[PDB]
Design a protein around this ligand. Structure first.
Ligand SMILES: CCCCCCCC/C=C\CCCCCCCC(=O)OC[C@@H](COP(=O)(O)OCC[N+](C)(C)C)OC(=O)CCCCCCC/C=C/CCCCCCCC
Ligand SMILES: CC(C)CCC[C@@H](C)[C@H]1CC[C@H]2[C@@H]3CC=C4C[C@@H](O)CC[C@]4(C)[C@H]3CC[C@]12C
Ligand SMILES: C[C@@H](NCCCc1cccc(C(F)(F)F)c1)c1cccc2ccccc12
Ligand SMILES: C[C@@H](NCCCc1cccc(C(F)(F)F)c1)c1cccc2ccccc12
Lengths: 300, 284
């Protein structure tokens, strides 16, 4: 026994005595040093505000808010010009508010995840986007109907006349407000500290809990997109001051392009870049919508 | 360790890992985008559909070839464009399977050459303001393709691509990938393929309002815009996919833009020739 050899301790075990005779296991929430001589605390990785990437996504999502505010100001100052009144000046306003809601949803992906944030992350963006899609769809059908008129109108009360314009949007949004409510009560999302995947790093993420709702939401938000194009296809022969086809088929194509190009990184990679690409995709879709439709007219 | 009373635990050879019970060594697992994975059948099926669609289109044009609509445009340039499009979808098929030595070399240049050829046809055709200064069209197309052919060759001499057999991503899993030789050649290839498309997109914007052949310039600028949007997005997707989905991202991007050039420029005229035979040297 007086004669022995020296062998290094394996990963995650340390020693601090002269003749160890055994490797002491590192305590929980700690990891061995480079030389296996003293345990050190692990590292927690999440999309924080200290790194410039976080400072960046935030400094975009303020520029978008400012641009949307500027656009709504023209439609409020020049609220009686023929081309502004050409597009629905009611439903055009409601859309702008929905776009404001859209830019904001992204700021719920920055910072340490918590229960309420993880629960409110997806439904807000889904509701806002479907609200915008419903606004576009109802506006388009009204003009086709106005311009498919054989014999004159018969609306019996002017005010209720504009009730249809607003209630159809709520009817469209009702299906996803339902799905969001039943989902949240029957299995709410919750936070989950994961340390199994990599030994030295603790990951803080959320947990979907029930995944079947995440398929129905995509199916619905997408089905509506298939309707925006068809109506966009049907609305190609109208005159210029009212035409809105090119814009519709480019915005939804951008949406599909981004959210189908970003599938594999989301499917494979784990960690902080998933949230990064989600934020960048949301921002890309929202700008795409805003400048496809409202900017030509804001130039004119 | 195998037997009883082991003084020390033997390491395992580099081509193996160790069983859950640490008793003995088993074989490592090699991962790569295969032809049987459920996520590659969709890509194979999608492509085959594109190939069949291109074959059908070249059918109608070389069958109803004695009509004013097809003769209004140049037939030779249409054949060249259809041939280039047929090679893009087929090229994508070169991005799926076990990476061999020669495949890594033929991955990029084939698509680059095909896309340069297809873009060059549209350029020689945008409202003839380009062609007014000044058969000549074939010479210009050959000159456009030759600079990409040359850059490919100097590159294959000075650094060919080959397999890597990476072992630094997953200790248990062996990754088979391609090492893309040098970066200057790839950067120059991308720069040229984008610079040509930029010029094509501009003159056509410029000539977007001329209603020649059912306003074909507008569809060309639509296709160019689609191509940019698709590839500006390729940046973050690939920059954050780590594993065996880089090939998937590349295939998805290539398939999108190929359909982008085929559909825009062809489907309106395909509909006109096949149905409603009422336009003959009047609306053409
Ligand atoms: C890496 C990411 C990849 C993601 C995949 C994306 C693939 C999509 C890209 C490309 C393939 C097809 C693209 C074709 C684009 C159409 C161009 C366009 O903009 O159209 C022009 C409009 C406007 O015409 P105008 O009013 O100015 O002229 C009026 C003149 N006068 C009065 C004579 C009539 O005319 C019209 O017909 C408008 C009718 C709307 C056209 C429908 C768009 C077809 C989309 C097909 C695929 C979409 C789903 C993708 C699959 C993934 C599912 C998740
Ligand atoms: C893969 C396929 C199905 C994607 C969709 C392609 C087809 C359906 C789309 C893409 C571009 C579209 C065309 C865009 C512009 C015009 C000009 C207009 O005066 C007639 C309709 C027409 C000709 C559209 C017909 C439908 C069209 C050809
Ligand atoms: C933001 C997203 N929730 C995470 C989906 C991750 C994903 C990553 C990459 C691709 C895809 C998708 F394209 F397959 F959806 C999903 C979301 C929530 C709610 C509604 C949505 C409607 C449209 C798009 C996204 C929606
Ligand atoms: C298929 C595609 N090459 C993708 C790999 C790019 C890359 C992969 C890995 C590293 C680097 C980097 F080194 F440049 F960053 C770049 C391609 C091929 C040919 C022409 C093309 C023209 C336009 C767009 C894409 C083209």
């Amino acid at each position: 026994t007086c004669c022995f050899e020296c062998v290094e301790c394996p990963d995650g075990e340390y020693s601090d005595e002269t003749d160890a005779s055994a490797c002491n296991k590192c305590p929980d929430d700690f990891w061995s040093n480079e030389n296996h001589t003293s345990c050190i605390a692990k590292e927690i990785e999440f999309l924080s505000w200290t790194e410039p990437f976080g400072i960046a996504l935030t400094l975009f999502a303020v520029l978008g808010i400012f641009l949307t505010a500027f656009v709504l100001g023209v439609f409020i100052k020049f609220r009686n010009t023929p081309i502004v009144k050409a597009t629905n000046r009611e439903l055009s306003y409601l859309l702008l508010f929905s776009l404001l809601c859209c830019f904001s949803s992204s700021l719920f992906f920055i910072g340490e995840p918590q229960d309420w944030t993880c629960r409110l992350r997806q439904p807000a963006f889904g509701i806002s986007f479907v609200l915008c899609i419903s606004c576009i769809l109802v506006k388009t059908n009204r003009v086709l109907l106005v311009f498919e008129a054989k014999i004159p109108t018969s609306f019996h009360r002017k005010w209720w006349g504009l009730n249809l314009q607003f209630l159809l949007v709520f009817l469209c949004t009702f299906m996803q407000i339902v799905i969001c409510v039943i989902w949240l009560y029957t299995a709410p999302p919750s936070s989950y500290r994961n340390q199994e995947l990599e030994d030295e790093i603790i990951f803080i993420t959320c947990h979907e809990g029930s995944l079947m709702a995440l398929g129905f939401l995509i199916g619905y938000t997408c089905l509506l997109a298939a309707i925006c194009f068809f109506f966009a296809f049907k609305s190609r022969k109208l005159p210029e001051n009212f035409n809105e086809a090119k814009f519709i088929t480019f915005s939804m194509l951008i949406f599909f392009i981004v959210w189908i190009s970003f599938i594999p990184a989301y499917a494979s990679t784990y960690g902080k870049f998933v949230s990064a690409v989600e934020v960048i995709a949301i921002l890309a879709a929202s700008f795409g919508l805003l400048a496809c439709i409202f900017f030509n007219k804001i130039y004119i | 360790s195998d037997e009883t009373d082991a003084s020390a635990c033997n390491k395992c050879p580099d081509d193996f890992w160790s069983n859950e019970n640490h008793t003995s060594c088993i074989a490592k697992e090699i991962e790569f985008l295969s032809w049987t994975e459920p996520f590659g059948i969709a890509l194979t099926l999608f492509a085959v559909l594109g190939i069949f669609l291109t074959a059908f289109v070249l059918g109608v044009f070389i069958k109803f070839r004695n009509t004013p609509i097809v003769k209004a445009t140049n037939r030779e340039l249409s054949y060249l464009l259809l041939f280039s499009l047929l090679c893009c979808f087929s090229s994508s098929l070169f991005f799926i399977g076990e990476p061999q030595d020669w495949t890594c070399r033929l991955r990029q240049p084939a698509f680059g050459i095909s896309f340069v050829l297809c873009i060059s046809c549209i350029l020689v055709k945008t409202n003839r303001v380009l062609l007014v200064f000044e058969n000549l069209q074939f010479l210009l197309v050959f000159l456009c393709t030759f600079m990409q052919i040359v850059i490919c060759v100097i590159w294959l001499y000075t650094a060919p691509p080959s397999s890597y057999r990476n072992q630094e991503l997953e200790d248990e899993i062996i990754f088979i990938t391609c090492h893309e030789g040098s970066l200057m050649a790839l950067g120059f290839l991308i720069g040229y393929t984008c610079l040509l498309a930029a010029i094509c997109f501009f003159f056509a914007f410029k000539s977007r309002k001329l209603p020649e052949n059912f306003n074909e310039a507008k569809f060309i600028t639509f296709s160019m815009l689609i191509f940019f949007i698709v590839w500006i997005s390729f940046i973050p997707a690939y920059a954050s996919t780590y594993g065996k989905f880089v090939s998937a991202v590349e295939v998805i991007a290539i398939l999108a833009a190929s359909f982008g050039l085929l559909a825009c420029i062809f489907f309106n005229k395909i509909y006109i020739i096949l149905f409603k035979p009422s336009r003959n040297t009047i609306e053409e």
